[PDB]
Every structure is written in C-alpha cells, then in structure tokens.
Design a protein around this ligand. Structure first.
Ligand SMILES: Nc1ncnc2c1ncn2[C@@H]1O[C@H](COP(=O)(O)OP(=O)(O)OP(=O)(O)O)[C@@H](O)[C@H]1O
Ligand SMILES: Nc1ncnc2c1ncn2[C@@H]1O[C@H](COP(=O)(O)OP(=O)(O)OP(=O)(O)O)[C@@H](O)[C@H]1O
Ligand SMILES: [Mg+2]
Ligand SMILES: [Mg+2]
Ligand SMILES: [Mg+2]
Ligand SMILES: [Mg+2]
Ligand SMILES: [Mg+2]
Ligand SMILES: [Mg+2]
Ligand SMILES: [Mg+2]
Ligand SMILES: [Mg+2]
Lengths: 898, 898
C-alpha cells in the first residue's frame, strides 16, 4: 500500500480518450464568487457604444482575410479548453522511452556485458529500442485514428469571413474551435452560443439562461440596452455566454473572448480541480496494473537471490531476474487498451454509431436499462391524417387559417404540426393571407404554460392574438366559444362535452391541439404572458402519426439481449399507451408525473422498477428518475434530443443521442447515432460487447503465460548450474510474442459470451493467471529434464544447445496455447479463429523455428540443433496442447470464465 | 458456313438451369386431342364406392409406414417431371471426356509420339486428363450448389403418414415431390392441388378451375356426387387436378396418380413437343460459341499447312496446330457460365433474394420497368385506425357485430380488415355471439361481383345474410337503410349523400367497406349468387393503413439506377393516389381500367409509357398491360403475390414474388424474396448486375490472349526452322492460366458499369478480340528476335533454350495483362482487384518461374536458363504492360467497352 513510487511506475492514458469531457457548457453552478476583475471587465465590455467595439478589436463587417485571422489566433490562442490539446509527437516518443524498467535494464546491460561482450550490450539496446518503437508506433497510430471521430460530429458556427477571392463574404460554417476574438457570427433558433458575444442587431431574440442562474423562463435579449441599470454581469441584456441556447428569434453578434479567458472557465473554476474523479474504467485499469506490479515485485527478488547465491556473478543474476520479470510490465496496458478500442470505434463508425470518447464502449455494452422517449423512437414523426374540425364537429376552414398564421409568423423550433399546417392550405389562400397581414410581436413557448402565441395585425386599427397549445391549457383560459357562427359565452356543460369528445378522440392515437384568438385594440408597448386572458375558443386539430415499421423486431431483439426498455414521455396518458400497445410493448400500469412529486427516494427507487411507462413528466422528473434507476447496481442509458434534456444525458451512465438535433443535446452526449432508430442501436450494442470481449482475452492470454515462465524459472534454476536461457533470447522471445499478438484485435468472438449484459471484474485476472500458469511449468521442467539426460547435457563448457532447445520449445508453447484457451468449446471444430491471427501465428512460428539455422545465430550467441530433437519437441507440444483442453472444465466450475 | 445441325461440337447446359420450368400447373390450354384411354380412366376412377379405393391401392387412414411408401414409389415412380431429374455423376464425367477436340488431340499424340518417345504420349494423356478433371470438378460442384436453392422454396403438402414408426399419425409437411400414389392429404384455403386427388369428405370446398376450362368462377367440390351425370373428365365433381387452387372451405382427399401419369401431362402435351424455345440466354451462349468455333476453323488449317510445308513432319504440324488452337475451345463455356452464376446465386441467397434458376440473374440486372401493387409494397398492411360508424355518422356498435359474424364464419383468405375486426371486439361480446349463433352456409368471394356472404342462424325459425364488400357493389343491391333505429326505404337523395360523405372519407387515405344484412325464413336447400337481393344497409367501416417507413429511399435508389416504377392497382382511383403522393412518387394523370377496354394495341402501347398509375384493373387488364410494355425492347418485371396473378408473373420477363404467399404465385416465379420490401430488391439488383459483369470479364479476357497467341504463331512460324514451343509447354501454359483464372468470380467491379440497366451484345467479343489481340503479337515477335540474335540461337541441334524463353515470357504476359484490361480507370491507384485474384496470380507466377529450374524440367523436355535473360524479360514485360494503358483510349471511343 501507499508507495508513491507505485503511482509513478504507472503511465496514464490522456484524459481526452478515457474521461468524459468536463465542460458541457454549464457543469455545476458552483458558489465561486470569483475575483471582481472578470465581473468588472464584463460590465465594462457591456457598456461601450457600437463604434468603440470597431476599434477595440479589428472586426470589420465584411469578413476577416486569411492573414489577419491567423495572426489574431496566434496572438490570443484557440477556442479550446487546455485539456483538449494533443501533445507533440517527439514528447510522446520520449515518454515511451524513459520507462523505469527499460532504463534499469539498459543500465544493467551496460554494466554487465561491457568489458568483454560489448556486442551483447549493443544488441540489448537494439532490442529495447525496437520494443519501445513498436509500442510507440501502435499507440500513436491508434490515438491519431481515434481523434478523427471526435471532430466528425463537432458543432458548427456560421461566420461571415471571406471565401472565394476577396470580400466575397460567404457565411460559411466552421467548427466552434476555429474561432478567433473579434469575429462576427449569426445566431438562429435552437443553436448553442459558442462563446461570449455582443449583440449588434436583434429580431426579438430569446435565450434560456437557466444553465447559469436557474430562472427556467427564457430571458429577452436586445441590441441596445432597455433596462436602466445592469448591476450584474449575467443580466446585462447585451452580451451572451456559452452553454445557453437560443429559444426564439434571430440576431447577429461578434465574439469578445475565446478559450479559457471567457466565463464558465476560470470564473466557474472548471479548469481548477474538478478532475479527481475516476469513472470506473480508470479504477479497473489501476487495479489491474497494481495487481501486475505486486506479482512482479513478489517474483523478481527471490529469483535474483537464488541466481546470485548459486553462482557468483551478481550483476548477471540481477539482469537475468529483470529479463525474466519484464514480461509483466504495466507499460503494456496503454497499448492493449488503445489499439483494441480504436478498432472497435472505427468499426462502429462504419455502422453510423459514431463514438466520441473511447471509454463509452465499456458502458455501451454493459447496460441493462434503456430510458427512451416516444416520438421519433417509436412513431414516424410524419403525420398522415389531420382533421381541422370545429367545436361542434364540422370542418371549419377558419380554424385552419387561424392556425396558419400562428405557424407562419413564429421563429421557434418547427414541430410535426407546423409543417403539416403549412402544407395543408392551398397556395392561393396562403398567398392572400401573407399579403393581408403583417407581424407585430411574439410570445415564445416556455414550460409550465405549454402555450405559444403571436400578435398579428391587418391594418392600423386593431391586433389579433391567435394561440395554440395543449387542450387543457387553452380550455383553462378561454371564456367564449364561436358556435354556429356567433360568439356565445362558455358555460359548464360545454366544458364537460369537450372533455368527453376529445377523450374519445384519444385512446386511438390521435393528438388534440386547440386554437384560440382575441381582438385587441391598437397598442404600442410589448406584450407578456399575462396578456393571454379571456380569448374565444374556435376548435381543435386532431392528427395521427403512425408507428414506425421497424419497431417490434428491434424491441424483440433488445429483450432477447437482456436490455429492458422504459418509456419516459411527456405527452398525455391516454395516448402513448395505445402507441405502446400497437408495437407489442407491455404497457401494463402507467404512472403520471403528479404522483412522483410527493414520493420519498426509497419509495420511488422501488416503484420505478415495475412501471415501464411514465406519462406527463417535466424534465425535473426525468432527471430524478434517471438518477434513481441506478440504485442497486444497474447501468442506465438515456436517449433523447430535445432542447431541455441537458442534465438527463449527463446524469445517466451513457448519453446516446442523434445527429441532426439541438446543439446542446449533442454537446452533452457520448454516442452520436447518425440515424434515429432502434435497430441501429441494437446492431451497435453487439459490436460494443464484442470489441470489449477481445480486450479481456488479450490481457489474460498475455499475463498467464508470462507468469508461468517466471514460475518455471524460479522453480528450475535452483539446481541448474547455469542460466537456462540467456537474457537476449528471452528478450527476442518476448518481442516475437508481441509481434504475434498484434492480430488479436481482429479475432472472432463466440455467440455465448455476449448474449448478456457483461460485468468486468478486475480480480478475475489474479485467479485465471494462477490456475493456468503451472500447466506450462510442468512441461517446461519436463523439457529441462529431457534435454539434460537424453541429449547429454549439463556441462558448463558447452551450454548453448540447452538454451537453444528451451528457447525453441518455449516459443512454440507460448504461441500455440492461444488457439486453445480463447473459447469454452472444443477448438478448430466448433469455434475457430480469424484468419489474420492464424497467418500471424504461422509466420511467427516459421521465423522462430528458422532462426537457429541462420547465419545470424552465432551473432546472437546461439547455435544449431540436431535433427533428432524434432519428434520429442512435437510430442511435448502436442501433450501440452491436449492437456489444457481436459483441464479447462474445472476452471469454469469455480467462478466463471466470463 | 451455316451448317447448324452439323455443328455438334457444342455441349449444352442442362435445361433445368437455364430454362423456365415448362409446367406452371396449366401452361397453355392448347386444343390437343385428348387421349381416349386417359379420359376413360378418369371417368372410371370417379365412380367407385368408398370401399373400392381401399383395395385399389394400399392406403390406410392411419398413415403409411416407411417401407410401403418406398416400395410403392419404386414401383410407380416419383412426383416429378422427367426433365427435372439429375443425371448420374459417372455419366457426367464421361460426357466431359468424349469431347471431340480432346479425343482427336489424344489420338494424334498417340500417333506422333509413340515410336520414339512413349513418355511424351503419356504426359499428353496426363495433361488432357487433368484438364477435363478440373472442368468436371468445377461444373459438378457449381451445379450441385445451385440446386440447393431450388428446393429451399419448394411448395409443401400436409400428409398424415407415421412419425414415430410405431403409430402416431403426425400430419407432417413434405415437399410435393416426395408424394407417393395412394396417400391421403388434407387441403386448406389457398393451397395449390399437388396431383390428381379423390375427395373423401368435404366442408363446402371450392376450387378455381379457371386454368383448364376458362370459366373464371369457382366450382363447388363434393365428396359424394350430387350431379346426375358427369359426361366430362373435368366436371366429375369428385376429383381434383394440379394447377388449380382452393378458394374456400376445407377437405380431405387421397392421391391417385402422380408424376407424368396425371392430367396436364400427356393430356396437355407438356412433355411432348413445345421444347424448341431459346430464352435469349440460350441464343447468346450459342452465338458466342459459333463465333469462337468459326475463328478456330479459320486459323487452324493455315498454320497446319505452313508447318507441314516448311518441315516434313505432317503429324507434328497437325498436332501443333491443334495445340495452338485448343485455347479457343467452345467446351470451356459451361464452366464459365455455371461457376460464375452459382456464386452470385449463393451471395443473393445470403441476402434473402433466393433465385430459383440461374438464368434469372441475366434478366434481373437488365430491366428498366418494374410493375408492382399498392398494398404490402408501399403500405404496412396493418391498420392503426378504424371507425365502425353508422349511416348518419355515429358509432353504431351494431355494424361491428354484423361484421364480426361475417369475419368469424368465413373460410377464405384472411385480409387486413378481418384481423382487426376479430381483434376490435371485447372478449365477452365475442363469446356471447359465438355461443348464440350457428353456421349454416357460405357464398364464397368471386370477381365481377366483389362481395362475400355467409348464412347464419340462431334458432330454427329464420336465418341471416350478412354481407360485406365495396361500397358501390353493395349500394347497387340494397333497398332499405336502418336509420334512426327504424327500417326506412332508401330513396335517391340518400344515395347522393353517401357517395359524397364517403368520397370525402377518401382523398385522405381511408378505405370504405359497407355492411348489409337481410332477414330470411327457414330453408333447406343451397344458396346461390342471386339470393343477394333487397338487403338493408346498416353502415360502413373506414380504416387506414399507413405508408411503410422504408419506401421513399427505396424509390429514390430505384430511380437513381434507372428502374422506372409503375403502379398497377385494383383499388379505388381516389385512394392509391394520396398514397402515391405521401411517399413522394409522382402520379400526374390517373388511368381507369374501364378506358383500356376500348383501346387498340397501338394506342395502349403509346399510352402506357407516360401514366405511372392504373386504377380499377381486372387481372386481364393487368396481363394485357404487362404484355404491351415490352414493345420497344424494354424488360418488364412484375411483383405480385395474389391468388389470381398467375398469368401475369409468367407473361412478364421476370417473375418477382414473395415467400409466404399463395402456392400458385410461388410456382410461377423466378425470384422468391424472403421479405416483402423495396430495399431488399434494390440491394439485390446491384449484385445481379455485378455478377454478370464478372461473367463478361471472364469471357472477354480469355479468348483475346489465345487469339493473339494463334496469330503470333501463324506470323512467326513461317521463317522459323523449328517449332517455337513444344506442344507440352503450350498445354501446361493453358492449364496454369486456367488455374490462375479460377479466382476471377470473386473480383471487385467498379461502380460505373452497374449504374445503368446494362444489356448484352455477343458481337462485341468479335471486336474486343481483334482490337486487343495483335497487341501481344508485336512483343512476341520482338522476344523471338531478341532471343535469336542476342542469345545465339536457332541452331537446329540446340533449341530448348528458345522454347524455354518463349514459354516463360508468354506465361508472364498472359497472366499479367489481366490486371489492366479489367478496368477503364488507371489500375492500382483508382481501381484495384480482389485479394484472391492477386494471390492466385502470384502463386501461378512463382510456379511458372520456378518450373524450368526444377528436377522435373528435364522430364518435360526443358532445360535451365542463364541469369542474364531476366532484365530483358522484365523490360519487355513492363513495356507490354504499359503500352496497353495508353492504347485503351481509342477502343471505348469507337463502340464502347460495356
Ligand atoms: N416547441 C415545443 N417545445 C416544447 N414543448 C412543445 C413544443 N411544441 C409542443 N410542445 C408540447 O409540450 C410538451 C412537451 O413535449 P416534448 O416534445 O418535450 O416531449 P418528449 O419528452 O420529447 O416526448 P414525446 O414528445 O415523444 O412524448 C408536449 O405536450 C408537446 O406537445
Ligand atoms: N379475398 C379477396 N380476394 C380478392 N379481392 C378481395 C378480397 N377481399 C376484398 N377484395 C377486394 O377486391 C378488390 C381486389 O383487390 P386486390 O387485393 O386483388 O388488389 P391488388 O391488385 O393486389 O392491389 P392492391 O395493392 O390495391 O390491393 C379490392 O377492391 C379488394 O378490396
Ligand atoms: Mg415581445
Ligand atoms: Mg422528444
Ligand atoms: Mg448546430
Ligand atoms: Mg512457457
Ligand atoms: Mg352453398
Ligand atoms: Mg395484392
Ligand atoms: Mg403452401
Ligand atoms: Mg501471348
């Protein structure tokens, strides 16, 4: 325990490949007051006139040429966090070369084989150099390939710039990282704010400043200040901050700060600390490395003492001990992780399952609860039927026109209703209505009201207040009904008639949306929420969106694989239960969102496991239920692409999203699907499990044989009067084994280890490496005895034959046990291996067997081999390969292979 | 030269692999003289009592043991046409060995090389044997693989038999070719009759005998005859014949005749005559062979005369002539065709595009018009909404039960409406209705009436006549309307109201189905079509089946590839036009099927090219329009799976069907999709186009080089005083080239030759072989000159050096030209080749190079080679390989590569 050196002998993968990005835009709204310097700077930056910003920076409303932009970027920096910047390649090569084991091995080789055998020191240096070069090349290629997927789904911003020749403007799109202070961008509806901005012109813009303050309701933004005093940096009504979204309207602005110099960085303390959080993966890797280093430190010094006490060459004994123990170095773990996860990431990218950071694969194949939504996931989102009826039940042709205006003079996100309404009316009426009315104002949508209104006028006499929304949210405010072509007061029986007729319209999959209007005199101020009072109800619009064809087979496959699907919707409870019944899902009993509001954590944690359907949920309920569903040991995934599902994605253990959605919903995600569906997800889960199934095998088959070799050396070398194998032979054996192992990430996995949500136990290695280690030791000692007695050996004068024989038999045994302990079934007749692995094994086997009979054998302190040794070698190899097949039965009976 | 009959040097592929099965069940009802013996036997069969058929055969109503069935099958035969039986493998080996070219070559080798060297004759025999053995193995393996896909979609039949051999009945399903005479089978609705039957018990069975008589109406089938006199073999009312389906009811019969001893065999004359029909493929395969044989007889005798006049060994000259000319043999075509089509068929089988006979691939990648049907191809075929309303527009709750009774007492094919109605009622009401009523009779469905009726009684006092069908086909009969709870007479305005309300229900995608009942007193006879008079209308049912999600991308992909899609529906003309608009397909103007009935052939031919939609079509219109769309030369495909689209699938140039359909629809089809969709078809069309490209390449890149070698020999053998290459070397060259070419049907085809509905022209082989042939003769004569002058040769005592050099350079030039005349782009940087082809090329190259420097070289009359010809070999090879790249430009600009 403790041993601060043990934390320095373990290298770490970069924090961009294994850790979730710490900056979603908001993260945690800490109570850090921060020095008043930044607040004063922001307040100063929010008061200068338009002309001052012209000269403070080099901004020009015609674009920035390709020369000034580079100079300004180099002067200031880049729009990236400090932790997201890759390291230089030469530093990467250097850090992979100063490993303590490698440096000690080189120093000890220089000490021992110098005064008489300088060539041995040279070849030792060559071997360590080639090993570290192989590791560096593999890791560098994998980490370069893994960063191409991160930039393929990056957010974009619309800058003006210059594109073609000169002053051509262009309004081209660039990634948010290629941003420079003093640059002008344009904001539209549903768009993340890249960095701190300064609005120049406005068109009734609204932003959701809830990620920083918690006001929930959107806050209006304008170019020239309208409030008398700001007194705060977050309410200046003139700037913008990253992490927020644009809810309504369009505007233009110019950036004033980028990188870590903005808000949410040093102001929120995101860079300061907040990094001492290992996310499971970083704990398992550390535990595995600690186990390996503990076993190495246990094994090495006993062998050192034995070889230093039997003979008198202490330096040689220490070097031999280090050479034997080098096979269990923790330095191999980064290669094992990166070179295997990168290939899985590329294969997933081939199936439109783009993965942002490599760690997501571990949680993507180990989950057992999927929390999705209704629209898009189950339904087509394209409606094929709609009836713009009236209050009595007749086609009106007035409700449709009163709903066209509300869906043509609004700048919010378009729905599945607005497109249908725009495509429903004929061209002539649309043109006439467009020519007859002019937009005046707009009240944007916000939750807890569920209602959107727009104010339109025809002439300079009066104004209209057309309105839509859910049926209950207009029926709760309206006061009159236009019945039989005349305005009549709304009494109580008419309220009990609509709630029956429209409830009958439900239970069939039809959604109901009401429409209300109001005549209002000529005003000059700005409207607000409270203006929507005492309107006249006109009618409703009932429409149907059918279920997607590829829904039932996806659910059957997900149930077969062990994943349980739960629906967290925010629609009505009568609908979303018929939809769940048309696709075969067992809705059972539903739970509304009002009951959850008065339940304790213990009650909810046990209620939420037998529901399968929650209706009428606010986002807070979603975020609470997602958190509570992870109670016992489960892994919970949330799939959603709305504008308000920012905390839910981070709260769950995975953040599955969809490409082509709101920017904030993609900035907080982990896996970005390229096509919203459920069959793609199902086919990607299988590959996610399969890729991670190779890593465990690649670790186990490498650790077990090395431990067996170390144990054999410890047991046998005591009686032997000389070193069984010279260290150079061990080094070249390890190098050849590492070369042969490269083809493992391209293996075949049986269809029995993946049809279950798999859980990773790092302590299984310490048992699998003890049960499968001495099996090689028995045959190694048998080969020692056979070469000693049959072939007239154990002569201090002549010993190269013994070392050559053990080298050959050891390489054969090490390389040929891979094909037998990779499966639970009988090999080569039920579960074979992939062709590249066989090809690499054969090539390495030929190279190893042909090395002693080569001109270079004498240079490497090795000699030839008699032709009578081959049958005994084959017999020993076949016996060792056969024995493990019979032994394998007892291991799984104890705790389980996987 | 003609002499088509004299040309018996053309072996033919079996008729079961390239020709459509001549027995679709009815074929053509030609007026052939009926054999009196067969008619007498048929009339005699259907008069015996129940007990006589017990002893006429060995049938027992408990099954047939696994011994009696085998003996009876061996005594009578098998339920298969004589043309669909495989040949013994030893006969296959023999027919591949008696090839006239091979026999003449062997005889001439025996004549020439026997009095001075028997070893030469021995090795000649060995070479020809190994060649014919390779061809036999390839063809046999491919034709064995190809017949596994033909029995995977074979029609089944429910026989009783014994499963445990101790007595358990079983009712197991077997293919219709394992049927033994004297066996009992059970018939259900929608089941083609396997063979001639004998009905034992009946449950109001109906069979559509419209494939042998043309009545077009179902004919009732009984168990004990009720008609007084038969007087005809096709109206006995007790027997069944193959080719006819079961429309309604269930029954149990016993087979009497199987195989070619049935009706439709010697009666319809299917086996006798009507065999001389080449289906395009059999014409191109003949013309290509004719061209090859014409060139061979043009080239051989001139070379024979030259080598017999220059030298004096006439036998050697003739043997050399045949050895040079053996490359252009027509015997290699069957291997080229089968071994390349079988792999494509297997790959299609891997994508659920199962192909019945191998010729369908040629017409599956060359079609430019696709004719399909609305339901199932565009809609999901399951309804998500339905309204069992009343005449005035209210939920009647009475029209539903009057529909449940009809949908619960029918025996015909189930529809999308019946499943919903059976699922659209609560369990209690269903149980009450089932326990209250009883079934009496049933009038089946038939076209030209478009309705179904069932007679149901509750107490023995009266009955009911609940009827279903189209709105116009029921409103044309009914006389009263149950309105406001009282039966009111129907008048004219009530007819102009329904046809407006229900036409407003259309234009939205809703289908309308009416319901009518009638109160009828107690009867004892059988009802007919005319009893449906003066019914009381109750209401209609409007439902909606939504479009399938994967429809628009499929249509976009099909339009990209050039496959124009046309709709031939049999539904209303108001619906099926909104459905086409929802999926994005253009409709324009709609053509009703009544207008087509009064149009000539030319007007219909020039009209059906710009319609894209046909509404309200009877099957005769479907067949006529399908026939008349092949006017210009286009290829027309029909997709359909109904009970009446039997002649349409055969009239079209390709019978695309769907697995799981009616048996008659599958028995008259070429491709059986395993999943109804428009994306599986699209992904299979590309593979179909791609396999034919590989076939064309494999044909083209073989004959041109051989013609080049023949021309080179003809040019250069005059002045040369001895044979440039001994015949054994040429034979081994051809053998090694064939071994290298084995891997061609695994190649990569560029995505430029398959983006158009390609079509085949056999005359292009007589041009590509003349343009690219002599391009190898210049380098061949240059190599001759270089070896003669630079290497001090053409001494009539030492000549093996010349033969060795030319053999090596010729093998190199033949094998290395493949990789550049296989694409139009620049090779190895824009379009590479598949790895197996490269591996085979490398292996063959190594074997060819190492052969002269081998101990066996002296046995084959071939010596070593000095280490100075290698640079000249490499230089000339590179020059020849790089000249054709520049030459390739002028070829495509003349008539086109493909
Ligand atoms: N632009 C909008 N933003 C938010 N809510 C909207 C908007 N337009 C309509 N609504 C209504 O507000 C409620 C919020 O539904 P929302 O789209 O957030 O649901 P969800 O959680 O994504 O799931 P699903 O829509 O599949 O049931 C619904 O009643 C919806 O009809
Ligand atoms: N069992 C039935 N057999 C045949 N036609 C039926 C049957 N039941 C109802 N019909 C009606 O008879 C007509 C024949 O339609 P059919 O199923 O043959 O069309 P189709 O050519 O396959 O094309 P579509 O996709 O429009 O259905 C339709 O009006 C259909 O509603
Ligand atoms: Mg406003
Ligand atoms: Mg949503
Ligand atoms: Mg965006
Ligand atoms: Mg070992
Ligand atoms: Mg009847
Ligand atoms: Mg049909
Ligand atoms: Mg069948
Ligand atoms: Mg040649």
């Amino acid at each position: 325990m403790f041993k601060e050196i043990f934390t320095r002998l373990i290298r770490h993968l970069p924090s961009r490949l294994v850790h979730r990005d710490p900056l979603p835009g908001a993260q945690q709204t800490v109570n850090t007051v921060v020095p008043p310097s930044l607040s004063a700077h922001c307040l100063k930056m929010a008061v200068m006139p338009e002309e001052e910003l012209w000269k403070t920076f080099d901004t020009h409303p015609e674009g920035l040429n390709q020369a000034e932009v580079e100079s300004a970027r180099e002067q200031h920096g880049e729009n990236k966090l400090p932790a997201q910047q890759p390291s230089p390649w030469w530093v990467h090569l250097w850090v992979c070369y100063r490993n303590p084991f490698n440096i000690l091995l080189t120093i000890l080789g220089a000490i021992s084989y110098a005064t008489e055998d300088l060539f041995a020191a040279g070849v030792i240096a060559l071997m360590v150099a080639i090993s570290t070069l192989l590791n560096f090349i593999q890791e560098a290629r994998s980490t370069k390939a893994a960063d191409a997927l991160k930039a393929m789904v990056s957010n974009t911003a619309t800058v003006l710039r210059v594109i073609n020749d000169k002053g051509e403007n262009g309004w081209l799109e660039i990634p948010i990282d290629q941003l420079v202070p003093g640059d002008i961008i344009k904001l539209a509806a549903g768009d993340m704010i890249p960095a701190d901005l300064r609005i120049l012109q406005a068109r009734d813009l609204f932003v959701a400043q809830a990620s920083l303050t918690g006001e929930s309701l959107p806050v209006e933004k304008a170019a020239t200040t309208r409030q008398p005093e700001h007194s705060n940096p977050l309410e200046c009504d003139t700037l913008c901050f990253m992490g927020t979204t644009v809810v309504s309207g369009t505007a233009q602005a110019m950036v004033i700060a980028t990188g870590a110099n903005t808000w949410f960085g040093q102001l929120a303390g995101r860079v300061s600390e907040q990094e001492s959080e290992p996310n499971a993966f970083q704990q398992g890797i550390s535990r595995v490395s600690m186990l390996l280093i503990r076993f190495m430190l246990v094994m090495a010094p006993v062998v050192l003492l034995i070889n230093g006490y039997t003979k008198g060459d202490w330096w040689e004994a220490a070097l031999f001990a280090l050479s034997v123990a080098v096979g269990l170095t923790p330095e191999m773990l980064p290669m094992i992780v990166t070179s295997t996860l990168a290939r899985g990431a590329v294969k997933l990218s081939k199936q439109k399952v783009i993965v942002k950071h490599l760690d997501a694969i571990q949680n993507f194949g180990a989950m057992d609860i999927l929390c999705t939504d209704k629209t898009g996931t189950l339904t087509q989102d394209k409606i094929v039927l709609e009836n713009h009826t009236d209050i009595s039940g007749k086609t009106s042709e007035r409700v449709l026109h009163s709903a066209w205006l509300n869906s043509h003079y609004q700048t919010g996100l378009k729905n599945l209703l607005d497109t249908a309404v725009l495509e429903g009316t004929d061209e002539e009426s649309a043109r006439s209505l467009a020519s007859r009315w002019q937009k005046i104002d707009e009240i944007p949508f916000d939750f807890e009201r569920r209602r959107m209104s727009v104010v339109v006028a025809e002439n300079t006499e009066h104004h209209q207040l057309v309105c839509k929304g859910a049926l209950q949210e207009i029926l709760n405010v309206c006061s009159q009904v236009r019945h039989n072509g005349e305005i009549v007061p709304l009494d109580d029986i008419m309220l009990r008639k609509i709630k029956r007729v429209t409830d009958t319209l439900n239970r069939q999959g039809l959604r109901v949306v009401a429409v209300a209007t109001k005549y209002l005199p000529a005003r000059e101020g700005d409207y607000q929420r409270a203006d929507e009072s005492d309107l006249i109800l006109e009618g409703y619009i009932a429409f149907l969106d059918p279920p997607k064809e590829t829904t039932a087979p996806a659910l059957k496959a997900l149930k077969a694989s062990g994943i349980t699907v739960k629906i967290l919707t925010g629609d009505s409870e009568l609908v979303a239960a018929k939809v769940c019944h048309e696709v075969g899902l067992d809705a059972g009993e539903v739970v509304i969102g009002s009951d959850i509001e008065t339940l304790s954590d213990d009650e909810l944690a046990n209620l939420a496991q037998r529901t399968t359907l929650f209706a009428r949920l606010t986002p807070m309920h979603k975020e609470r239920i997602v958190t509570l569903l992870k109670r016992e040991g489960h892994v919970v995934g949330f799939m959603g692409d709305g504008i308000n599902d920012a905390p839910a994605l981070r709260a769950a253990d995975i953040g599955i999203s969809v490409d082509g959605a709101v920017d904030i919903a993609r900035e907080a995600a982990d896996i970005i699907l390229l096509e919203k569906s459920l069959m793609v997800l199902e086919e990607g889960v299988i590959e996610g499990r399969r890729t991670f199934a190779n890593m465990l095998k690649y670790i186990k088959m490498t650790a077990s044989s090395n431990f067996g070799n170390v144990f054999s050396v410890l047991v046998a070398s005591a009686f032997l009067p000389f070193l069984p194998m010279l260290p150079l032979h061990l080094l070249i054996q390890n190098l050849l084994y590492d070369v042969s192992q490269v083809a493992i990430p391209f293996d075949n996995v049986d269809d029995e280890q993946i049809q279950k949500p798999q859980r990773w136990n790092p302590a299984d290695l310490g048992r699998f490496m003890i049960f499968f280690g001495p099996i090689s030791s028995i045959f190694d000692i048998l080969t020692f005895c056979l070469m000693w007695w049959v072939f007239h050996a154990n002569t201090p004068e002549t010993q190269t034959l013994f070392q050559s024989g053990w080298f050959v038999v050891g390489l054969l045994s090490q390389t040929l046990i891979v094909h037998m302990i990779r499966t639970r079934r009988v090999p080569f007749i039920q579960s074979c291996a992939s062709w590249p692995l066989m090809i690499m094994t054969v090539i390495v086997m030929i190279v190893g067997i042909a090395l002693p009979f080569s001109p270079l054998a004498s240079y490497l302190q090795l000699q030839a081999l008699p032709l009578s040794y081959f049958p005994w070698l084959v017999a020993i190899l076949a016996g060792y390969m056969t024995l493990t097949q019979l032994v394998k039965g007892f291991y799984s009976r104890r705790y389980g292979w996987q």
